[PDB]
């Protein structure tokens, strides 16, 4: 089958939805392709919109992916590593506050290193975005989870901020953070983007996507 | 190798959802099959429900289709043309107002001619429906978008009414029109069925279905 | 094709949703796999919520399955019989009252006999469950619908209680029973589990699943 969402689109798959990709190692993977936004051809690998899915999960869970196709999910670190082995994939982050105001952030490339290197983030340069840049700090850093502490803190940031991310100590972004249904409900550390609304001021809806 | 939704149902696909058809041309086509309404086997080729998708699109977009399997879409004029080359597909239109009342219109056949003929509508007679007949006028007319005006107006109906359709000068129905959440938000030209709620009094939800 | 949901999970299908299984007879079957609950790998064959789907159906409807991938459904007695002829399927029932209290029941095995045997329930022992046992009484009984009365009563239990089930002199469980949006607007007989909330006190959400 197809290697990515751009190729599905070219062959006339014009509706956003769940499609199979054939990974380089010859394995099939269900992914959500956004065929509509910004030209289309985006592979959505993370999505937050209602708090129905628990994102405070272990190393194996984040490695393999988890969640619901109808709602919230993380595609999986190993899938992201395999997809990003070859090709150049731009990252688009989409964020929406409780007022429906949408902001964005675009990076030239996105790649994850392998499990041996703790799925370390290799991020390209920030090109444009109304949300601003809150991911560059995390470039070069290992992913850490509650049961796999690899950060640069003398504590475990996954536990501290209740998430999983390429933590330093701890973050400028935490998009896999704990869901809050409004503001009054907001956590001390939530689904935050520092240079957008700042730490402790979360978003209602989030997507991360590659093309 | 299934060619439509009734075929799928015959083979035991009894739950409404997204399936793949195979076009006579050798292309796989995700479609929504309604497997219950009036015996089931309906291919839904247009849906509106929340205003999340922009429907003011070019000739090319409408030709190839656009939208979101999870929400609102147009399956695409070339797809509809290829589906309807042979066989005779009945058309059912479903309409839901802001109160939640549902009305309907049924036509004996629905077929689109090729792109060479501007995806001209060929429509059978209205048979019955509580919505009334607001499509007959459009039978025998070419499709029109903002960048390809084939209508019977001195101006471009698609631009005037902000939609795409088999426009005359301009319409009795406009189901690809601009979304409105209420009818306080209603545009002068919206998602309209003239014999139902009238021009300028839109519907919250719409589907167009063949079989 | 894969034989069950745990085999899919095993192969990297970690997001809950609709996958195809391939039955002994080679017939591909769309099913919902829950890839999370109790470690994931559950095939959900029944789901109630909202009440958008009519569950008062014929023998042949229950045989074939009906409903909506998006919402409520019954997968099909014939499907279940086919799945369940090669063995070891634990049953898990999930119940949710009108505020959001979830209850459960587990049975070691679940199997449906063929049509000639009226899709008779063959149920293993009740292992544990906060909802208590309400299905042990229906084990060994034939399925019945309004147009096929096989029950242990001088009356027609499917019509009397407005559902379809392996009724005895009717039920200790009535999960395919009529939907109540609230109590307030409950039913003498509804989506009930006697050892739980009890007859006349329905649930809002329900799933029946196999692993
Ligand atoms: Ca640390
Ligand atoms: Ca004109
Ligand atoms: Ca009887």
UniProtKB/Swiss-Prot annotation, chains A, B, C:
Disulfide bonds: 5-33, 157-170
Calcium keyword on record: yes
Domain Fibrinogen C-terminal: 1-211
Summary of the tissues where the protein is detected: Liver and lung. In liver it is produced by bile duct epithelial cells and hepatocytes. In lung it is produced by both ciliated bronchial epithelial cells and type II alveolar epithelial cells.
This protein's UniProt keywords: Calcium, Collagen, Complement activation lectin pathway, Disulfide bond, Glycoprotein, Hydroxylation, Immunity, Innate immunity, Lectin, Metal-binding, Repeat, Secreted, Signal
Glycosylation-annotated residues: 101
Residues that coordinate or bind Ca(2+): 149, 151, 153, 155
The record's account of how the chain is modified after translation: The N-terminus is blocked.
Principal location: secreted
GO molecular function: antigen binding; carbohydrate binding; carbohydrate derivative binding; metal ion binding; signaling receptor binding
GO cellular-component term (any): extracellular space
GO biological process: cell surface pattern recognition receptor signaling pathway; complement activation; complement activation, lectin pathway; defense response to virus; host-mediated suppression of symbiont invasion; negative regulation of RNA biosynthetic process; positive regulation of opsonization; proteolysis
Subunit structure and binding partners: Homotrimer. May form an octadecamer consisting of an elementary trimer unit. Does not interact with fibronectin, elastin or zymosan. Interacts with MASP1 and MASP2.
Recorded family membership: Belongs to the ficolin lectin family.
Record: disease: Ficolin 3 deficiency: A disorder characterized by immunodeficiency, recurrent infections, brain abscesses and recurrent warts on the fingers. Affected individuals have normal levels of lymphocytes, normal T-cell responses, and normal antibodies, but a selective deficient antibody response to pneumococcal polysaccharide vaccine.
Protein name in the entry: Ficolin-3
Naturally occurring in which organism (per UniProt): Homo sapiens (Human)
Gene: FCN3
Part of the full-length chain shown: 89 to 299 of 299
């Amino acid at each position: 089958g197809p290697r990515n969402c751009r190729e599905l689109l070219s062959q006339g798959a014009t509706l956003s939805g769940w499609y199979h990709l054939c990974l380089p190692e010859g394995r099939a993977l269900p992914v959500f392709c956004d065929m509509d936004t910004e030209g289309g051809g985006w592979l959505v690998f993370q999505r937050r919109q209602d708090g129905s899915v628990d994102f405070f999960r272990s190393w194996s869970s984040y490695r393999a992916g988890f969640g619901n196709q109808e709602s919230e999910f993380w595609l999986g670190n190993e899938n992201l590593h395999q997809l990003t082995l070859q090709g150049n994939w731009e990252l688009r982050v989409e964020l929406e506050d409780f007022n429906g105001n949408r902001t964005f952030a675009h990076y030239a490339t996105f790649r994850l290193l392998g499990e041996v290197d703790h799925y370390q983030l290799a991020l390209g340069k920030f090109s444009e975005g109304t949300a601003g840049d809150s991911l560059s700090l995390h470039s070069g850093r290992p992913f850490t989870t509650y049961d796999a502490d690899h950060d640069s803190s003398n504590s475990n940031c996954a536990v501290i901020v209740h998430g999983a991310w390429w933590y330093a100590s701890c973050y400028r972004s935490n998009l896999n953070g704990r869901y809050a249904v409004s503001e009054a409900a907001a956590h001390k550390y939530g689904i935050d983007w520092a240079s957008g609304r700042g730490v402790g001021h979360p978003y209602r809806r989030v997507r991360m996507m590659l093309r």
